Write a protein that binds this ligand. Structure first.
Ligand SMILES: [Zn+2]
Length: 240
DNA sequence: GCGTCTCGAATCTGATGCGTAACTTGGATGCTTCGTGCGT
């Protein structure tokens, strides 16, 4: 895939809705997924309504929405893709911690989109940049766009295991929060501050926010075993 | 019209108890769409 809207016609294969206008002016980017809207394509003027609180993430002021985004803005699409991973084969659910560990330790090779919501249901279909290479995974968490490097996650897990190797009571070296909301998120704990070497402390302080978020779901006393997430595109298509 | 001597001294100089108790020891929110109907 190339664009967030490309997930529709490639893994959902949903035909465009009826009654959509046809573009007849100089091409302009979509207001959601930044896809160009060329002459002869199907679009619709923006009618997001007063309850749309994602104006800051709009690609442009074209006020035009391509049919793929019009599909992606349906309630069944927003709810189904709350904790989704959209790859070529299908849409997978990464809600469970084991799924997150598998994704951030053994990512799929193909381009994919990573979905995650910080509340009941949020606009995430059209805000996630594509992950071209598995070594640089871009994850959209609520209003935060994260960059996760699997090698950094593996190195941090190795550091935590080596620091907790001797002590019988397991204790995390770095303070992390699943919601990425705590005031101490990403800061070293007392055990990390006074039981780790200078190189390990410098590495743990110099990780990206996305890596902290991922370790908040992976790094624990009993590391979850990675497992393949289930196929979810069937459920979303049936509910639509 | 003073007048001067003497113009202190020893010793005690604190003891004893009490010298905390019970209860609170958080709570709530931070999402949009969709259908149906008002409605100004
Ligand atoms: Zn679009």
């Amino acid at each position: 895939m190339r664009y967030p809207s490309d997930v529709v016609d490639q893994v959902f294969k949903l035909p465009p809705d009826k009654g959509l206008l046809t573009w007849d002016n100089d091409p302009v980017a979509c207001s959601h997924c930044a896809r160009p809207i060329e002459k002869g394509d199907l679009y619709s003027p923006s009618s997001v309504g007063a309850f749309f609180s994602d104006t800051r993430n709009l690609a442009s002021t074209s006020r035009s929405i391509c049919w793929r985004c019009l599909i992606l803005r349906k309630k069944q699409m927003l709810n189904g893709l709350s904790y989704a991973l959209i790859t070529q084969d299908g849409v997978f659910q990464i809600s469970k911690d084991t799924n997150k560990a598998w994704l951030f330790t053994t990512p799929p090779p193909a381009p994919f989109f990573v979905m995650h919501s910080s509340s009941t249901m949020q606009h995430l279909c059209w805000r996630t940049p594509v992950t071209l290479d598995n070594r640089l995974i871009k994850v959209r968490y609520g209003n935060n766009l994260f960059v996760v490097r699997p090698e950094a996650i593996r190195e941090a897990l190795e550091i935590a295991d080596r620091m907790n190797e001797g002590q019988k009571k397991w204790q995390a070296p770095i303070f992390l929060d699943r919601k990425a909301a705590d005031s101490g998120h990403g800061a070293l704990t007392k055990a990390g501050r006074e039981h780790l070497s200078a190189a390990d402390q410098e590495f743990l302080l110099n990780i990206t926010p996305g890596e902290r978020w991922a370790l908040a779901y992976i790094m624990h006393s009993k590391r979850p075993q990675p497992e393949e997430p289930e196929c979810i595109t069937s459920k979303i298509l049936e509910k639509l």
